[PDB]
Amino acid sequence: TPEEQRAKNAKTILENIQIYERMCDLFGVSEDDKLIIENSISIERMIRVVTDKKYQDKKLKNAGSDPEKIANAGKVFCRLVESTAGKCSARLGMALKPNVEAVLTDVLGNELDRAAVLGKRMGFSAMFKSNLEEVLYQRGKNQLKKRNAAETFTLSQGASLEARFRPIMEKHLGVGTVVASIKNILASKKNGNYRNKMVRKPGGNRESWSPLEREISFLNKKLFPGPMRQLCKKFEYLNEQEKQLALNLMLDASLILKPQVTHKMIMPWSMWLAVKKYAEMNKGSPSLEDLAAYSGVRAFMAFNTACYMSKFTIGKGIVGDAEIMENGNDKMQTLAMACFGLAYEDTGIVAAMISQPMKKRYQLRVGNFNPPEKGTIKGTSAGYFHKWAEFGNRLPFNSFGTGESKQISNSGVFAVQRPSTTNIQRLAELMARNTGETSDNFTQLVQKIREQVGAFADQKANLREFTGGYIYDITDVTKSNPKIPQLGG
C-alpha cells in the first residue's frame, strides 16, 4: 500500500504542478521566474482568497449597488515577481475568477465542491503560509484580536490560518492553536462576531457535532495520556472560567509535556516545479513518486534537491530595523523553518543537520516574500541539510508508567500458604478510571500536573529521543554514523 500512497501523492503534487504551470502562464510569468518561491506564495495566496467561501458570503453582503465593486468581483489580482538584467520587480498580473476556476476545475475536476479534494491540498499550503507568518512576525495584528501572549503563541503553530482550514489541519496544528481557538470561542459566545456550526468526518468518526465537540476531540487527540486526556474528558463539565483556567494550565504544561503532535513538511509549489524541471534537466532519473510523502527522509531528499539550483529574490532592505543585517542563507534557514515546521524544534539539532550554526529571533533576518519595487535574484546554496534525521511526533517516554503486566493481585492454582504482591489500591484506581469517576477532578488534575512536572524534571535525565536518534550524513540515510549535536558550554 505505501507505494500506491506515494503514487496518489505524486498525482496530487502533479495536479498542483499543472495548476501552477497554468497559473504561471496565465499571469504571464517568465520561464525562469516560474521557479520563484515568492511566485509560489503569490499563487497560493490568490487561491486562498478565491476559495474563502465565508469571506465571499461577507463580500456579497457589502458588495452593494456599486458597479466598481461588481467589476472587481470578476477581476482577480496577483502580485508576482518578474525579472530583467539580473534585477527584479513586481507585476500586477490580472485574470478573471472564471480563468482561475477553469484551471482548478480542469485539473481537480468540475466538482471543486468536493471540499475535501481542494481543501486538503489548500490546507497544507495555507498551513505553510501560517508557518512562514509565524516565523516572520509573531502574529501581532491577529493576536490583538485573539487576545493571548508569547508563550501561547509558541504553542499555536498554524494559528494564522483562516478558520475553515483549522478543521482540515487537525493533526499538525500546535496545541495552542486549538486552545486559543476555544478561548476565543468563549469570547465569541459573548460578542456575537461568529456563527456556530455542525460537521462530520468520514474515515475517522461519523459523529455529527459542533466546534465544542470538534475542538474537544482534537484536544483529546493531542493531550497527554492519563491526567491531561482525563481533563479532556471532563472538559464538557468544567464551567467556562474553569475551562479557561484549565486551558491555561494545560497550555503551560504543554510547554514541557510533549504528547502526540504531528510534524509535517510542505515545500512550496514552485519547489515542486523546481523538482520537475530538475528531473527534466537531469535527463530521466529523478522520479517524483520517490519524493511523494508527508513524512520520512523523502522530504530531506526533496529539500536538498531544491538546494541545487532553486531561485528567489534578494531585496537589499530587511524585515529588520537596526544597522545589523545578514545574508540569503538566513532566508534559506527561514524557508527550511517554514518548510519543516522547525519553529519550536531544537536549534542544535537543526544546526547539525543544516551543518551550520542555528539562531533565535534576536539573530534571525529575512525579506517579506512580497514582490518588490526593485531587487536582485539569488539561487540556492548546495545540499544544505548536509546531515538529515528521522522525524517524529511525541516525547521519548512521556512519563513513568505502571508495571507493564506483573505485580497485580496474584492468582493461585497450587494449594500452598503464601505471601502476595498486594495491590488492591491501584486496582481500585483502574476501576475508578474505567467507571468514569467524577468527584474532585479540576484540582486533582491541577495537582497531578504540578507533580508530573516535578517527575518530568527528574525524567529529563534520559527524556531525549527515540533511542536510535542521531544526525546522520546525506551519504548515510543508512543510519550508520550515530553522533551527538553538542556537549554543552
* Cell numbers describing residue 424: 488492591
Question: Does residue 10 contact residue 240 with C-beta atoms inside 8 Å?
Answer: no
> 311 and 378 in contact (C-beta within 8 Å)?
yes
Taking CB under 8 A as the criterion, the residue among 30, 348, 356, 368 binding a second copy is: 348
**Whole-number Å distance between alpha carbons of 336 and 338:** 5
Interface pick for a second copy out of 15, 330, 465, 476 (rule CB under 8 A): 465
Shortest distance in whole angstroms from residue 99 CB to a second copy: 37
Q: Which is nearer to a second copy, 212 or 457 (CB)?
A: 457
CA atoms of 100 and 109, how far apart (whole Å): 13
**Subset of residues 263 to 322 that bind a second copy, contact rule: CB under 8 A:** 263
Helix locations, 192-226, DSSP H = 211-222
SS3 313: strand
Q: Tell me: does residue 147 bind a second copy (CB under 8 A).
A: no
Figure out which of the listed residues 52, 252, 473, 476 binds a second copy, where binding follows CB under 8 A. Answer: 252
- Shortest gap between Cβ of 161 and a second copy (angstroms)? 19
Of the residues 7, 281, 324, 457, which one makes contact with a second copy according to CB under 8 A: 457
Q: Is 167 in the site for a second copy (CB under 8 A)?
A: no
302 φ/ψ sector (left φ>0, alpha ψ -120 to 50, else beta) = alpha
3-state secondary structure 408-445: CCCCCCCCCCCCCCCCHHHHHHHHHHHCCCCCCCHHHH
Residue among 361, 440, 461, 478 that touches a second copy (CB under 8 A) = 361
In this structure, what DSSP letter does residue 77 have?
Answer: E
Report the residue from 191, 419, 461, 478 that binds a second copy according to the rule CB under 8 A.
419
Question: SS3 helix, strand, coil % of the chain, rounded to 5?
Answer: 50, 10, 40
Q: Does 98 bind a second copy (CB under 8 A)?
A: no
Among 36, 178, 389, 445, binds a second copy (CB under 8 A): 389
Q: Considering the rule CB under 8 A, would residue 144 count as an interface residue with a second copy?
A: no
Q: Per CB under 8 A, does 239 bind a second copy?
A: no
Q: Considering only residues 1, 193, 420, 439, which one is a binding residue for a second copy as defined by CB under 8 A?
A: 420
Q: Residue 151 CB, nearest distance to a second copy (Å)?
A: 7
220 interacts with a second copy by CB under 8 A: no
Which residue type occupies 390?
Answer: E
404 lines the binding site for a second copy (CB under 8 A): yes
Which residues, 362 to 381, sit near a second copy by CB under 8 A?
362
325 binds a second copy per the rule CB under 8 A: no
Least distance in angstroms from the C-beta of 51 to a second copy: 29
Question: Does 255 interact with a second copy (rule: CB under 8 A)?
Answer: yes
Q: Quick one: which of 71, 85, 144, 415 contacts a second copy (CB under 8 A)?
A: 415
Choice from 408, 447, 458, 480 touching a second copy (CB under 8 A): 408
**How far apart are the C-alpha atoms of 192 and 400, rounded to whole Å?**
45
Burial code (b: 16+ CB inside 10 Å, e: under 16) for 262-300 equals bbbbbbbbbbbbbbbbbbeeeeeebebbebbbbeebbbb
CB 299 → a second copy: shortest distance, Å?
Answer: 12
Q: Which listed residue (220, 392, 473, 474) binds a second copy by CB under 8 A?
A: 392
Instruction: Please work out the total of residues on this chain that contact a second copy, with binding judged by CB under 8 A.
Output: 71
The answer to whether 121 and 9 are in contact (CB under 8 A) is no
Q: Hey, which residues does 375 pair with through a beta bridge?
A: 88
4, 140, 468, 478: residue in contact with a second copy (rule CB under 8 A)? 468
| By CB under 8 A, residue 480 contacts a second copy | no
Kindly provide the b/e burial profile for residues 221-255, where b requires at least 16 CB atoms within 10 angstroms of the residue's own CB: bbbbebbbbbbbebbeebeeeebbebbebbbebbe
Interface with a second copy, residue 422, by CB under 8 A: yes
